[PDB]
Amino acid sequence: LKAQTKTEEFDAIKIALASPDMIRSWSFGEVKKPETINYRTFKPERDGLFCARIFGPVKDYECLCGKYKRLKHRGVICEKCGVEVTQTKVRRERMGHIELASPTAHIWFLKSLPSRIGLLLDMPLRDIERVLYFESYVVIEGGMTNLERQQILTEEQYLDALEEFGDEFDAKMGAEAIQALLKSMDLEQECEQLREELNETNSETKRKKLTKRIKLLEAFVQSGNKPEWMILTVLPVLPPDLRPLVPLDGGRFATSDLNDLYRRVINRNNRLKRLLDLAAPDIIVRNEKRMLQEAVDALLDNGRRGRAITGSNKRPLKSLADMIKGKQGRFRQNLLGKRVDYSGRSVITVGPYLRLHQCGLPKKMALELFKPFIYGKLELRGLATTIKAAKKMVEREEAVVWDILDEVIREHPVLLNRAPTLHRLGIQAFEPVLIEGKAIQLHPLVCAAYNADFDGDQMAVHVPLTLEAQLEARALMMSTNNILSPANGEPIIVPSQDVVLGLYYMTRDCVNAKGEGMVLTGPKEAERLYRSGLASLHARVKVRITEYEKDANGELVAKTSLKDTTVGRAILWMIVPKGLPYSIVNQALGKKAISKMLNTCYRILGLKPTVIFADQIMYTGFAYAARSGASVGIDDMVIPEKKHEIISEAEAEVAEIQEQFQSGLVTAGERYNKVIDIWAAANDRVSKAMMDNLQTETVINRDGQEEKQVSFNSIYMMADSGARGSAAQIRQLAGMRGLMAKPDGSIIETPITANFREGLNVLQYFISTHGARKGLADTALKTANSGYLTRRLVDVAQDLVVTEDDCGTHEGIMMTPVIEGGDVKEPLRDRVLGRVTAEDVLKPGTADILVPRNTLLHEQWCDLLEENSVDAVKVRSVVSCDTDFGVCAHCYGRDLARGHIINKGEAIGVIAAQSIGEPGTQLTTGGLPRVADLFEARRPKEPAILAEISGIVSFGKETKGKRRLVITPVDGSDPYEEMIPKWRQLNVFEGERVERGDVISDGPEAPHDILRLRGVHAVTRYIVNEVQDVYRLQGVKINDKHIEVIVRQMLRKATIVNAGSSDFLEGEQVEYSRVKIANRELEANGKVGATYSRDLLGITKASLATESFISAASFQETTRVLTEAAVAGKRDELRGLKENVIVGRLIPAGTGYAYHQDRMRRRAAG
């Protein structure tokens, strides 16, 4: 078969240096003139930056001169002025060139930090630049006389040496010099010689640089790049429409800055050719060559020399490098964003009538958005003759079009998105419901996922177009299909505020109320008792209920009974579906309980019942909260009667200690601590006064004189239910508020005695103001820090995707309850839930396997483990996965919005990064910066040091700035000796044995140490436990999984120790390496297999290494990446997410995982 020549669907991409002949291959003509357009007739001046002949026709299928105007003549080259008449679009495509007079350095390869021309020649940068500027002479191929090959000479020196040796010696200067150097260079010979020199001399200094350079050279040879190409003989010109002259209003013109630059280049070039033909003196033509160099540099990348300025405008002109780089840090237009058709946005409102699967979409918006569908559906049914008439109709908004819109809307989902998109739930698919209004209506239960208030936040709509997009939106991005946070299995659909105040008010009980003590047949006549005004919503009552238990085999058992409950609970029970026990609704129904109701319902009945359940819960919560008549008055906030007395006594203490400071019994600072302590104690007392009084003070009589229960006061119910408010804010309302602190952080010893229910005076308010402003500032800052962090995270993860099914390794980490210092800061059940078992586990007695090797532990399995006393389970993790270049689903876990095991092909790196990132706004060394420090693996300020090796140790030498520690292993050799500065107080016992990784001092320790001296499981455990300490201290739920995948990405690279295939000390992929030593253990060499050492790379560091260069050019410094890749002739195969996002094809994950896989196997095959 003939493979192909012309257009196919391409794979990979290649980048390298460009030959002059190559640059010519692209060029369809040489632009010889600085002229742009004719100045009256605006036609392009022929062979100029804007040209019809070289580039293309000005208007569609029309010759410039005007002779051939017909769409027939096409491949015709006009005789008058040759222009092939073709679409004007080809003026957006065709390149050009300029043949420079003198050679020119390409500023990218001269000024890139590791100067390419420089280190290829082993020639220092400043020397090379000194040569290019004609500031000195440099030797080339010196032969055998007096002189080194790379040696530089001055005027007089060159003269003398020339007088001595006429021939068999050579020296040039300028660009031609460097080009001659590069051309003369033989890489292979240098290779041989350097291998030898590497071998002969033993010094670290010598062979380090030696090996680095030889590797560099041989890489450059293998590239296919010849050094000469770093010096430009020919300069390509960019297509005109990519740097347009296009006219504006007022007859004014506007053009790209590349025109000024290209113009300058052409000018000085032609003038140089002229100066050559005029036989000018050296001092002139040299100046001209230099100026040409500067012009070219300014064109390519401006700012590495002089930063030339555009005509009449101070602001420096944008060069091609600046064209590529973009702005806003690193953003390549697939990054910062891209404008998109079929979209819209507006202010959002509530819409409680909605089912959770839908959203209100404004009429006009739907019309405009679905306009093309409407056009097609209108003439398909034949209501409109032609598409034109269809437009006329929808523009007239004729009566018949609304029905057609209702047709095209029905099964067609739409995507809704909010401004701060963090986790994947930031975008959710809904079924559109036509609404009269300009506002978008969004289901209340979703408001938590978007973090969307109703205070004027806006949402954007996007219309999924292709069939695949509709089905993706419906089966993936659909609201009902994500009920659970991907971070943790807990429901994100949890009722928010009004609803929970409703369910809370519903099931609650007062002491005495209408219908107290009576009995009812069932929930029906309970509700009937309530709605008729006979019985009160909350009263202690026995009613018969019928509950169910699915506890049979897949089967629902029925049981009936007389339960002691209230009227409200009885009414509410009507909603609860099937197999749930009445136990769940018989409580007070707080936010937590009202959430666990949903959770249990989902882990029992399945998805659909849970969906409709949540819906009904919302409806009833709203309705009954509305009926309840909850409100807030000024008298709802109750101040303690004892407040003033507490204030007075605590105010007596301060005058006590003040008297002592006057008499000098106590020091000023000690005094300060004392007074601050008494005032703090005061605040605690007032708070714990107002809390008792607010909470229990309802004193009410049933048939006797008195009884007291939890208060029915509004603000209390609100704070208690979890609807809104909290003990702190309520404390600020009634009790006194806090003690403030100056910006310094020195806490003021005269606290705010007054509260918000009372007035604050001038000073108090002024002092509160700082707290406010710093609050807004800090929060608004932590948003940015969160974003930056997530960014680093997806950058370090991204392409990690579930790929294989099961690697099948027994490997994994030991999962224990966290058990910190007190009782159980987090159980075992949460840590092991949804995680696969590495191996079978035991009862206290054995040959009884409860959980059999690798099995997803769901709620039932975890409860079965809980029945038994088992404290310990070994669990497979993403960090331990044997699979290379990805994670097997069997290792990951089940976690998702769905309880089933993770699908094959879902991209986990991204969702992990997101899951870690989203809560980051809620985090307060400790803190979010501590989190960053952890993920960056930064060695702390005052780190500890761990024993290098086990065995008895002792102290040696003296006081040089380090008092040396000598370790003595039992069997093995002693010589390990570390230099410990003695000015730091030690721990380690001079007479005792210390295990490797023991405490030889105090303070935090760098995870590099934990990785080396303790090992991979130990280091991953340290990272996960510390970061989880940070999050969990703030009340943030994040599964260990995501952190573990980030960790896996951190340790991706490692350094080799032994040899037999590749180089000694190289940092490299443990995927590559392990797949190589697994392959080397058999066949090949019988075993030559090398030993490596696992390395720890920070997230920002590990992100640096990416196979794909297109990917790297996105988030890294673009200018460097492009060069560094171009010299190696690096070939990007795509294969990742970011790269395929940039190039604009299907993501090698998700739905596209079926595509890229089917193509991946076709590649490197028959």
Binding site: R355, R410, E411, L471, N481, N903, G905, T1151
Partner: protein, 89 residues
């Protein structure tokens, strides 16, 4: 309307390949080559296809098989037409 796709996800495991298969069948309906295997409620081809997945009468196996048959069904017709191209010799 299909409020939840979970059942279809039960019928084919992947849930991505669900989107793919359902899309394929959906196009078998939308471009008019074929007709529904189950009553159309005014549900668009998008949802009809998913209903077809839930009923278990449509998946990758069935589709591949049917297409493979239709290939030979066209080969049957064009048999006498293309064998007449013996002028190639």
């Amino acid at each position: 309307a299909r409020v939840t796709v979970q059942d279809a996800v039960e019928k084919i495991g992947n849930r991505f390949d669900l989107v793919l298969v359902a899309a394929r069948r959906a196009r078998q309906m939308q471009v008019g080559g074929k007709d529904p295997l189950v009553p159309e409620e005014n549900d668009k081809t998008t949802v009809i296809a998913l209903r077809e997945i839930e009923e278990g009468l449509i998946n990758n196996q069935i589709l591949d098989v049917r297409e493979r048959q239709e290939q030979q069904e066209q080969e049957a017709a064009e048999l006498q037409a293309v064998t007449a191209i013996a002028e190639g010799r």
